[PDB]
Amino acid sequence: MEVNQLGLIATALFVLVPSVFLIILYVQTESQQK
Amino acid sequence: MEVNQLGLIATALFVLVPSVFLIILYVQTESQQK
Amino acid sequence: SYPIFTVRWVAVHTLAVPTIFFLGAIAAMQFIQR
Amino acid sequence: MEPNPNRQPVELNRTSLYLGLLLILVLALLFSSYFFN
Amino acid sequence: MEPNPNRQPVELNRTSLYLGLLLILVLALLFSSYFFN
Amino acid sequence: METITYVFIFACIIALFFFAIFFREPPRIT
Amino acid sequence: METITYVFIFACIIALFFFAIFFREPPRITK
Amino acid sequence: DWRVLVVLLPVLLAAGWAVRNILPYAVKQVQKLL
Amino acid sequence: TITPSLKGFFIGLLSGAVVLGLTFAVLIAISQIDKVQRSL
Amino acid sequence: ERGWFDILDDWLKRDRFVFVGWSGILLFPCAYLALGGWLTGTTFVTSWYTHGLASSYLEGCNFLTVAVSTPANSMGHSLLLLWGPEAQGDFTRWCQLGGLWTFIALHGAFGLIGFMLRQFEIARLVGVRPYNAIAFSAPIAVFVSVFLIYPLGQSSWFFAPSFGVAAIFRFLLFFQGFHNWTLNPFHMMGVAGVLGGALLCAIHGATVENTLFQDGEGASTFRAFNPTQAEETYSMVTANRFWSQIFGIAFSNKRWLHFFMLFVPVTGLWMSAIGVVGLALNLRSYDFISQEIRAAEDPEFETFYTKNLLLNEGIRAWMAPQDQPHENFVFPEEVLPRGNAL
Amino acid sequence: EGGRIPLWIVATVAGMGVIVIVGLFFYGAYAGLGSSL
Amino acid sequence: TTGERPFSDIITSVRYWVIHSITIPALFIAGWLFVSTGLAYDVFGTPRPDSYYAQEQRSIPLVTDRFEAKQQVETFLEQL
Amino acid sequence: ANLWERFCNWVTSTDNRLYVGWFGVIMIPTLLAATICFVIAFIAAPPVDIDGIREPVSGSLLYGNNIITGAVVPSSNAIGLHFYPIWEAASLDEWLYNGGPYQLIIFHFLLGASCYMGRQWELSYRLGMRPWICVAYSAPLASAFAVFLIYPIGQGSFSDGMPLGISGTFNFMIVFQAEHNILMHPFHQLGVAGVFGGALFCAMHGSLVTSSLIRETTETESANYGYKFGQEEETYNIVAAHGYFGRLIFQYASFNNSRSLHFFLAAWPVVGVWFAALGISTMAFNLNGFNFNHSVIDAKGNVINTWADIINRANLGMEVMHERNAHNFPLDLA
Amino acid sequence: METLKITVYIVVTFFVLLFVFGFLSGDPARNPKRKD
Amino acid sequence: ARRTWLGDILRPLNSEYGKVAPGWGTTPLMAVFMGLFLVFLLIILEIYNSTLILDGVNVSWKA
Ligand code: CLA
Ligand code: CLA
Ligand SMILES: CC(C)=CCC/C(C)=C/CC/C(C)=C/CC/C(C)=C/CC/C(C)=C/CC/C(C)=C/CC/C(C)=C/CC/C(C)=C/CC/C(C)=C/CC1=CC(=O)C(C)=C(C)C1=O
Ligand SMILES: CCCCCCCCCCCCCCCC(=O)OC[C@H](COP(=O)(O)OC[C@@H](O)CO)OC(=O)CCCCCCCCCCCCCCC
Ligand SMILES: CCCCCCCCCCCCCCCC(=O)OC[C@H](COP(=O)(O)OC[C@@H](O)CO)OC(=O)CCCCCCCCCCCCCCC
Ligand SMILES: CC1=C(/C=C/C(C)=C/C=C/C(C)=C/C=C/C=C(C)/C=C/C=C(C)/C=C/C2=C(C)CCCC2(C)C)C(C)(C)CCC1
Ligand SMILES: CCCCCCCCCCCCO[C@@H]1O[C@H](CO)[C@@H](O[C@H]2O[C@H](CO)[C@@H](O)[C@H](O)[C@H]2O)[C@H](O)[C@H]1O
Ligand SMILES: CCCCCCCCCCCCO[C@@H]1O[C@H](CO)[C@@H](O[C@H]2O[C@H](CO)[C@@H](O)[C@H](O)[C@H]2O)[C@H](O)[C@H]1O
Ligand SMILES: CCCCCCCCCCCCO[C@@H]1O[C@H](CO)[C@@H](O[C@H]2O[C@H](CO)[C@@H](O)[C@H](O)[C@H]2O)[C@H](O)[C@H]1O
Ligand SMILES: CCCCCCCCCCCCO[C@@H]1O[C@H](CO)[C@@H](O[C@H]2O[C@H](CO)[C@@H](O)[C@H](O)[C@H]2O)[C@H](O)[C@H]1O
Ligand SMILES: CCCCCCCS[C@@H]1O[C@H](CO)[C@@H](O)[C@H](O)[C@H]1O
Ligand SMILES: CCCCCCCS[C@@H]1O[C@H](CO)[C@@H](O)[C@H](O)[C@H]1O
Ligand SMILES: [Cl-]
Ligand SMILES: [Cl-]
Ligand SMILES: [Fe+2]
Ligand SMILES: [Mg+2]
């Protein structure tokens, strides 16, 4: 199938950028003193 | 130029995956108490 | 008082003895003509 | 230099992480077809 | 369950982050031409 | 490449279901 | 896309220089 | 081969002269160790 | 049978055995003759 | 308890001028023979039958041109043992066949193993951490990849480096012409590690020597240090300020500094070894495909990359007939690539 | 007798011997084998 | 110190030079003769200036067989 | 204090985050000018007629290069050693065709780097340090002068200066080998000894200090936290390091004096790189590497090749191919 | 181009003057110990 | 620590931590097997290498 050649990077960055943002925030919350 | 179409995604992930890993570690270090 | 033959003595001579021999050999080579 | 008193800690609990990841992954599952076209 | 006592905190200081990002970016600047080929 | 991308996203979702169920923050009565 | 990529990585490196110098962990004398 | 004798002739005469000049001090070293 | 290279192999095997044997014989001998001195 | 092993152990580990140890049993004979083999070959031994070259002082070569040359290509990867099926115990023929090459390479290899074992042994006995042995893994990675793995992937030992100054220079130029080895990113990391290492050596030495505390009256400042002194001989605080203001960043941690000094050149050499492992299989960074497609279609498109391939093409055509005599290359004048006039 | 011939004389004579032998090697670069003639 | 006599003591001593004014020249002369007698050529199989080529031959005697290499060199040396 | 006096005080202030200084007054604008021009040119400059034969070489990213092939291309052979500032061109289009950016960059860079060296003396003086760090930096500086200035002067053209790029660098090296046999030149050999040895001694010193760090930390923490910035006590045991290295080789082959050790670490690579710089600077005037081509001859007079002659065959390949359209006459005399 | 030349000539002179007069402004005295 | 049915069955197999035979034990016999193994590796290397050539052993695709 002749799909758009930027579709892969568009999807990968769409997933990775905000997921990473969330992962960063979660892990630094856990590491805070309880 | 007729470059490899996977060159972009390869470069992007090569940068992002380990950079993100370090950012995760750094931020959760900062948020620890002392 | 001091020993004469030692491990150090052997190590020194394993190098010194062929070196002088070789130097005499290379000295002689300087007079060889085609 | 004196610390800024306006600084606040930031949080994201585990449930929020899971809710957020679900949002991102399902959005990508939805939009990906259109990105590939 | 009772906590696992082998658990340990993990650290990466600011200098290490900077050194790490430099390594990564410079490795990317180097290998990218070969990836594009 | 598209199919890989679709299957990958789907697989990440199922993995998320797993962690969200079995490794949830346990509800506690204070 | 390649030019963009190369210029992007370079720009990120230059930004990193700025932070490494001006927003470094300040050296503090102790024992 | 005759050259083997001609080449090693100075070597053996040197080793013998070294033994004669060290034998009183070599026997003395070996008897001290034994 | 014993090809020339199998003979060569045995020769190399024995030469190494002899080199190693003599080396350790000489070192064991010298070690026994010149012992270290320790406090009782 | 105090048997022959323990007695032998005592003697091996005596505090003497040249430490021996258990590792010395491997190290000293192999190192001595490697060096002895090289000196013997370069003084007396030809490369006429393997390469069509003179290679010894006896033949008229000088220090720069002598070599212990690799065996002929027809030898394949023969271990070429003296008692092997090629030389059949004949020492003269063995020399003529390049037996000294495998002799030096193999004794050299076991010698380096012994040296690194020596590094481990001494460190254990003196009670220091074995970082020196660890750093020596880089010279080992280099020797093994270049002198063993490279020729093993190629047709024969013939294409391994020959043990000589000019012969090594030939190896460099061969790698440029045939492998375009300068274009390889693993070689480039190697270069960064070596030049970066040399930089770190120079800058650290100079910094220490120029931030010294005055601990004596002498204008010659070397006597104003005692090995057993507790105090640092130079100011880390002053050194740190200087560099922070000059370069923007400076070391602040002395332990990190010195570890980084291990890391940089050690990692670089390791990377270069990985590149050579690839070249063993002709798995080169020879080309950029995009550059070639463009250049083929567009005869006005030129870069320094295309310029360097033309040089490689010249190297290959001009050096190959004499450098690879087993191929019996005859390239008539007319086929030789040449620019105008030259 | 351990100390009779002064070390500075030994060094000077040894050094001069090195210069003579290396000098001979250089002379040989211009005569006989390896001379190009 | 590790126990052995200092090198400086040794090389400044009369007994050292009594011994080595003999051993050193002897080894040097032995090396010289190794070359001057031509024995070095025959031990190692290194061609003399007149033994690289036959008079009319202008082809290098390259070894081309692995297991008949020894005989090949012998054949080459016969042809001289 | 008047305006000038306060300005002088600011310029020479030891309290600036980055020291300015008087050398800095020249260094800052020249390095900025060189940097800005370099970046713009590397990205966007059109092809340059390096060899003056109307055969423009593309160096920039936008004109079909990557990081590895890209370069700021040396100025035209038609210019030679002529000064070619922007205002000497009829237009920027001409300036670019002829490789004007190269000259702008290298002249600004060399001046700025010379002032970088001066600045290192200057701050050392302000801080009450000893003054010779700048002498160490003269080795790499001299090497930059060698490839960007001295070699072009000797050869009569900035077209033979080293290109400002990764592949252009290799081009410079290969052609240099063809024309000067640099590998066979003892100053380059000294240079190699300097950099190989500098790397060796770097790894050596790094490993020995690290090997003898005094225990100040637990198993679970980095040993680097065992040293605190500005502590008065030394952080490793040199006597133990010496005890190790003296036994690895022999006692008198190892340093027990830290000052002497560090001097050696400074001197070895610096002197070697001085010789490397001098290799290029003297091959600039065509005093070339050793030539043993056809040095070994048999009884009849047949040439018996050595590895030198095989080097020669490789060099001939580079020679005949380089700048394939530039030569009209049989000898390449510059 | 003439305007550019003049501008650069002025810029360069300015900075060169700063360097010369700057180092002439009692530089040996600008150190942390003996100000002479 | 938690006991399980399987843990109890396997208990004996993880109960002898640090247990040693006295002195040199079987080190001499180990050395002999190591020596023989070294000779074995040398043999197969030299066959593959064509340094050891045996009757009926043609080291090639054609056998
Ligand atoms: C520890 C020191 C050491 C080591 C590791 C080596 C290793 C090597 N040598 Mg070097 N050598 C040494 C010291 C050493 N040598 C000394 C002191 C000399 C001076 C005599 C030499 C002179 C020398 C020459 C002339 C040559 C070598 C060669 C070799 C290679 C092949 C060796 C081989 O195949 O033997 C195989 C033997 C063993 C591995 C020993 C076996 C021991 C086992 C464990 C016991 C079994 C043996 C048994 C008792 C005997 C029964 C046999 C019976 C059935 C007939 C290898 C790189 C060859 C080479 O370099 O070719 C290119 C070669 O030609 N060596
Ligand atoms: C540079 C090489 C090198 C170095 C410095 C070390 C260092 C170390 N090894 Mg490793 N090892 C190596 C290579 C090396 N090893 C290789 C290539 C193998 C085979 C896979 C091994 C297998 C090995 C094991 C299984 C173990 C070690 C262990 C150790 C440690 C203890 C010392 C020891 O056991 O040495 C071993 C001795 C040697 C490497 C010297 C071998 C000399 C051989 C026998 C000479 C053979 C000559 C040969 C027959 C000639 C014929 C050649 C042929 C081509 C013709 C130490 C960290 C031990 C450790 O980790 O303890 C906690 C451990 O358990 N080593
Ligand atoms: C089979 C059989 C027979 C077995 C028997 C084996 C047996 C038992 C033998 C015993 C008998 C015996 C000894 C025989 C000897 C045989 C013999 C002569 C073998 C020779 C082996 C051989 C080829 C050796 C090669 C020679 C060699 C090692 C040369 C290198 C020497 C050399 C130039 C060393 C460098 C010296 C130097 C100036 C180093 C500086 C490095 C540096 C700046 C380090 C930084 C640094 C340094 C410090 O100093 C400290 C402090 C710190 C902090 C620090 O940063
Ligand atoms: C002196 C001749 C120049 C050769 C270079 C070696 C010294 C200068 C290089 C140092 C640059 C490193 C950065 C500064 C590092 C630094 O700050 O150094 C500091 C160091 C110690 O300083 P001091 O103040 O104690 O001594 C210097 C003066 O004050 C006099 O006491 O200086 C020296 O040791 C100078 C030694 C000169 C003695 C002569 C050396 C000759 C070497 C022989 C080279 C032969 C080459 C052979 C090749 C085949
Ligand atoms: C290329 C390296 C770069 C260095 C450039 C600096 C140039 C200055 C020259 C320094 C060169 C270093 C030599 C220091 C020399 C030095 O300056 O100190 C002088 C020193 C004085 O010692 P003494 O006269 O006190 O005698 C020693 C006895 O007292 C000890 O019992 O003599 C030696 O150590 C030389 C011994 C020759 C070695 C013969 C033994 C050979 C055995 C082989 C060694 C095996 C190594 C183990 C690995 C396998
Ligand atoms: C091979 C072999 C073997 C062995 C052997 C040997 C062990 C030998 C040796 C040897 C040797 C051991 C030798 C030697 C030598 C030497 C020499 C030849 C030298 C020299 C020198 C020189 C010439 C010097 C110079 C210089 C320098 C380096 C530096 C600076 C200055 C000068 C210039 C002084 C055997 C029988 C087992 C068997 C088979 C084979
Ligand atoms: C696409 C690329 C993405 C790469 C993903 C990489 C993921 C990396 C995950 C890092 C995991 C860190 O894991 C985190 O460690 C810290 C300590 O450092 C723990 O934190 C624990 O120790 C700290 C410090 O004593 C206490 O303040 C805290 O109360 C305690 O819970 C967290 O409970 C844990 O969540
Ligand atoms: C490519 C996609 C990447 C996207 C990048 C997104 C990065 C987002 C950055 C988030 C940074 C969080 O910022 C971080 O906040 C925590 C608290 O939450 C702070 O931590 C502070 O508060 C906590 C909690 O009271 C204390 O334990 C701690 O001692 C204190 O320093 C850190 O000092 C700060 O570094
Ligand atoms: C941050 C600073 C960075 C530095 C940036 C450099 C700025 C460069 C600006 C260049 C200005 C353009 O220069 C412009 O070019 C035209 C033609 O090309 C020139 O043309 C002019 O001079 C020539 C002189 O022979 C006449 O023939 C012509 O009739 C006249 O119009 C002028 O000199 C100028 O009007
Ligand atoms: C075409 C060129 C021909 C060359 C002619 C030769 C003339 C040389 C000119 C010398 C004039 C320089 O004179 C110099 O000026 C400066 C700035 O005003 C003075 O003033 C300075 O005084 C002190 C000196 O400790 C400084 O701390 C202070 O910052 C500064 O004001 C110097 O004390 C004075 O010595
Ligand atoms: C040189 C190979 C090293 C192998 C070590 C095996 C040691 S073997 C061991 O040796 C003891 C004395 O040392 C004896 O008491 C004992 O009987 C014997 O089994
Ligand atoms: C390192 C040198 C060791 C000496 C090797 C022994 C030489 S052995 C012997 O020597 C004869 C010379 O008369 C040759 O004719 C013969 O071919 C050769 O096998
Ligand atoms: Cl070119
Ligand atoms: Cl011309
Ligand atoms: Fe240091
Ligand atoms: Mg001569």
* Polymer length in residues for chain M: 334
Number of domains in chain L: 1
Q: Residue M302 is nearest to which of L2, L48, L52, comparing CB atoms?
A: L52
Residue N7 C-alpha, separation from nearest chain M C-alpha, in angstroms: 11
CATH code of the domain covering residue L48? 1.20.5.860
Binding residues of C: 13
With a 6 Å cutoff on the Cβ, whether N31 touches ligand 10 is: no
Q: Residue G28 is nearest to which of M39, M61, M229, comparing CB atoms?
A: M229
Residue E8 C-alpha, separation from nearest chain B C-alpha, in angstroms: 13
Q: What's the rounded Cα separation, in Å, for the pair G4 and G12?
A: 12
The residue ranges of every structural domain in chain I are 1-40
Taking CB atoms within 8 Å and a gap of at least 24, the contacts of G18-27 are G19/E18, G20/E18, G20/E22, G20/J248, G20/J249, G21/J248, G21/J249, G21/M18, G22/M17, G24/E14, G24/E15, G24/E18, G24/J249, G25/E13, G25/E14, G25/E15, G27/J240, G27/J244, G27/J250, G27/J252, G27/M229, G27/M230
Whether chain C has a CB inside 8 Å of the CB on K28: the answer is yes
* Helix, strand and coil percent figures for chain N, each rounded to 5: 65, 0, 35
Whether J45 and J56 have beta carbons less than 8 Å apart is answered as yes
- Half-sphere exposure at residue M152, Cβ-oriented, CA atoms within 13 angstroms: 26
Annotated binding-site residue? L20? yes
For the domain spanning I1-40, the CATH number is 1.20.5.510
Ligand nearest to the CA of J215: 4
> Which two structure tokens, joined as six digits, stand for C1?
């008082």
Q: Do C23 and K31 touch (CB under 8 A)?
A: no
Ligand nearest to the CA of M104: 9
Dihedral sign, Cα of residue J317, residue J323, residue J328, residue J330:
positive
Report the atom number in ligand 10 closest to the C-alpha of M2.
Answer: 31
Among candidate residues J77, J122, J119, the one with its CA nearest the CA of residue J98:
J77
Q: What's the rounded Cα separation, in Å, for the pair J163 and J176?
A: 19
Whether chain I has a CB inside 8 Å of the CB on J244: the answer is no
Q: What's the rounded Cα separation, in Å, for the pair C16 and L22?
A: 14
Q: What's the rounded Cα separation, in Å, for the pair L24 and J232?
A: 48
Type and span of the H or E element at K3: none
Chain C hits for J57, CB-CB cut-off 8 Å, are 25-26, 29
Method of determination is X-ray
Residue H23 C-alpha, separation from nearest chain L C-alpha, in angstroms: 12
Chain H neighbors (3+ CB pairs < 8 Å): C, I, L
Q: Do C17 and L27 touch (CB under 8 A)?
A: yes
Among candidate residues J198, J193, J203, the one with its CA nearest the CA of residue J251:
J203
Among candidate residues J335, J98, J10, J225, the one with its CA nearest the CA of residue L63:
J98
Write out the residue range of the structural domain in which residue L37 sits: 1-80
> Which two structure tokens, joined as six digits, stand for J46?
């030809």
Ligand 12 centroid from CA J97, angstroms: 14
Count of E-J CB contacts under 8 Å: 12
Query: Which is it for strands J163-164 and M164-165: parallel, antiparallel or unpaired?
Result: unpaired
Q: Do L62 and J49 touch (CB under 8 A)?
A: yes
- 3-state class of M126 per DSSP? helix
Number of domains in chain M: 1
Rounded to the nearest 10°, the torsion over CA M194, M197, M202, M205 is -130
Which amino acid is residue K34, in one-letter code?
G
Write out the residue range of the structural domain in which residue M140 sits: 1-334
Q: Residue J248 is nearest to which of G21, G27, G29, comparing CB atoms?
A: G21
Resolution of the PDB structure in angstroms: 2.1
CA–CA distance from N10 to each of M24, M104, N5 (Å)? 19, 17, 9
CA–CA distance from M235 to each of J244, K33, M223, M230, M231 (Å)? 22, 58, 11, 11, 9
Among candidate residues K34, J327, K25, the one with its CA nearest the CA of residue M303:
K34
- Taken in order of first residue, the domains within chain O and their CATH numbers are 1-51 (1.20.5.880)
Among candidate residues J190, J175, J182, the one with its CA nearest the CA of residue J280:
J175
